[PDB]
Structure formats: structure tokens, C-alpha cells
Amino acid sequence: GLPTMNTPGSCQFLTSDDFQSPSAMPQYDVTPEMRIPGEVKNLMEIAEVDSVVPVQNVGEKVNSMEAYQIPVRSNEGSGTQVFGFPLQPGYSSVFSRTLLGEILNYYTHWSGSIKLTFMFCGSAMATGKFLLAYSPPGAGAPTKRVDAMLGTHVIWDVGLQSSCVLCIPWISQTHYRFVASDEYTAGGFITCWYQTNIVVPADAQSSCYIMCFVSACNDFSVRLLKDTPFISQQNFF
């Protein structure tokens, strides 16, 4: 016949290969398709959807709904911190089990902007202002309000419209950052402070909560598939 020669990689099973293989059932006609609502064609469709972030998660809070709630209250003075967590989804305790964060433990690399939304869930007599800050890395976390207003920030005023978005720009030396912890591809720190006290009248609760959401922007992308560390087994089920 036709003289041929085999090359390295013949008679191997590579799990990522695409080759054609004969059907075991030939001339089998499959059932028609129907239009089912909500077809998914990309996983960045469903990473652009808001998901409640468990900011609190200190001891026994993860075994309750108190994880999702962020305390804020009427206190003396202002310029006290409300929360702080580091930017690094798919590593951080805060972000690893969010909807964004679990489409990001299947990938090694990530790029793009992330938008946090906050929703004030006090009474309609409560009012206040917050400073929602993001600091690039290289100087540690800000420990005062005056240190935190030197970074990117938004001042949020609560009225009608009970949410505000802090969009986190992409500021990185590299085009991608590792999903896993590395100090070369450090993300920075996201902190919140009282710009002004929570002020309430009599007969309205002086303790209120904030809920946080996280989603990707439209410039976001992920790269390089890998197994997730979050599912295990000891035997077949």
C-alpha cells in the first residue's frame, strides 16, 4: 500500500484529544430539540450574575444566615472600619464559594474588572454615608479612613436608591493574575468606613445591616482548565 510512517504519540490516550470515532449505533436518529428557556453557551454569562457574598464568616456565622449580614450601627464619631477583605477571588474565604468564585476554581488565570454592589437594609428613617475604598497592593491594608481615601473610592449616600456599586478597576502589572495565592500577583484590599454616622430618630432601630454582591464585568475572562479542590470522594457513591 501507500508507504506511511508512525510518529511519537501513536497509540496513546490523551484525555484532551479531538478525533473522530465510529458510532456503535449507526443511523440512530436523535429526538428533536425544543426551545427550553435559558440556554447557556458560555460560563462568563453566569459569572456576570450578582451573588451574595458572605463577608462575615467569623466562627459560628457560617452555620447560619448571619454570614451574609454586615453589621452597621450608630456609634460615636466616624471613620471606624466596617469590613475589610483582600481582593483575590478563588482563594479568599469570603469569595471562594460565591457564584463568581466557583467558576474560577476551575481556572488558573483570571483577568478583568469585578463589581461589588451593596444594599442597605436598615429602616427608611435610617440614613448615613460610607466610604467604599479599594487600595492597590504595595503598602499593606489601610488602617485609617485617611489612608483609605488615597486609593480608588466612592462615597455612598443612602436615600431612595438603596444600592451603590464600587467597580474595582483592573490595575495589574501582568495581563492575568493567578487564581491561587501568589504574592507576585497580589490583588489589593477592599475596605469600608463610616463617612458619616448612622442617624435614626426615636422608635427606629439604630442597628442595620448591609448585604454585599459580587459579579464580573464584560471585560472579564478566565483561562486554563484544572480540577477544583472542592469536591472529594473516598469510594464510588
Binding site: 492597590p136 504595595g138 503598602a139 488615597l150 486609593g151 478597576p169 490595575i171 495589574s172 502589572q173
Partner: protein, 252 residues
Amino acid sequence: SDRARSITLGNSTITTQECANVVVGYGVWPDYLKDSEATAEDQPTQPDVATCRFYTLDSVQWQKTSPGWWWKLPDALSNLGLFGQNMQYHYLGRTGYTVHVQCNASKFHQGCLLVVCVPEAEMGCATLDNTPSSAELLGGDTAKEFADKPVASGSNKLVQRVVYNAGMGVGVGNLTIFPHQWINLRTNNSATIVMPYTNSVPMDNMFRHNNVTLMVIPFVPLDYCPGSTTYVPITVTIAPMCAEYNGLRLAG
């Protein structure tokens, strides 16, 4: 004629009467980052004439026995002017340099220097299972010096400094692929190199990465007869070129 040169950046002006031309990088002149190579999405800070101007570093004596000197570039200007005040408030920045080395002596003196700008000059340690500390590599506008004899291996965080290996484990006579000039005392008294920004990332933090290292190495020792001047200094002058900074935060 061909030996006269003047370079004006900001306030500063340098003038020489003996000049060997200007070497420019790899034939690439400093430029600002393009929007088709940029990654960071914030608006840059570009201070212009408050960063991009000549800064003189401390002088260092050239003696009959001297082995050489090195300065690591962004961290030798880190305490100087508003160049030093933009790189501790920002996470990122990129810049080229114009390095000008001066050394004048009479027509009865002799000696030769090699002036090189070496991209990413990573330097060995005297002890082979340790890496150097940052107080043995970095001056701050004070020059670090080579040695002429091997550094003994203790339990050291010391650099292995020997002129003939250049502290990198390479022949010192092969450092001539890097942008370079020679100061030969019977010809010229100054050397000018213009480096462009060289990195594998478009901007980088400048307080933990040094992307260039200047080295001035005698290949022919200083020699003169009795009655001549016995003190000959070497002054280094360095100007940023097209500095940008991005990622404004708190100082540190």
C-alpha cells in the same frame, strides 16, 4: 564639533567638550506606553518635568587599585526629588533612563573604564544555599563596590563580588553586548547611554524589581607619576525618560 554635546531635560543641562557620541539602547528611544500594549485601566500620572531631569548621585574615588562599582537603577533614585515621591505612592510605573558618567583627568593620566547598563542583573551569593539580602545589593545613591578576591563562604547573606565574574558568573569581557561606552582618559571624559524600558510586562512595581544595573569597571588601572593630582572622582548623573505611574494609593 563632534565632541561637543548638550542635553537638556527639565531644569537640568549637561555640557561636555569630549564626547564619544550617545549610545541609544537597542536602537529604541524612550516612549510612552501605547493603548494597544497597556493592561491597566486607570488614567496614568505623567509628571513630566518634575521627574524627567538629571539627578547627580554621590561621587566615588578612582584609585590605582579599585575594582568597580554598581548602582541598581530605580532604587538609586528612590530618595531623590519627586521621582522618589511618585514611586512610593503608586503601585506601577515605567521609565527609560539617560545615564551620563563623568570622569576628567589630565593628559598625563591613563586608565580605562567600561560603563554598561545591564538589564536584570541578578547577582549570586557567597554562600551557595542562601540568596543575598537587600542591604547588600542596594545602595540608595551610594555605590556598592566589587572585590578583586573571592568572598569567603560563611553563613552569609553577602553578595559574591569579584570583578572578573562580574558578580553574575559570566566573563566580564563579554559585557559588551549590553549598551556600553568606554571612558579612555586620553580620548574622552564622559559616556552617555540612553536606555529604553525593558521588561516582559508593560509596567512593573519599582520597589521590588530593578530592571537595570549600571556598572563602572576599570579594565586598565589609573596611573600617573608623582606631582599629579592623586584624587580623581567619578560622578554619575541619571535622568528618567517618559516616566508614568499608575495605581495611586497610600505612601509606603
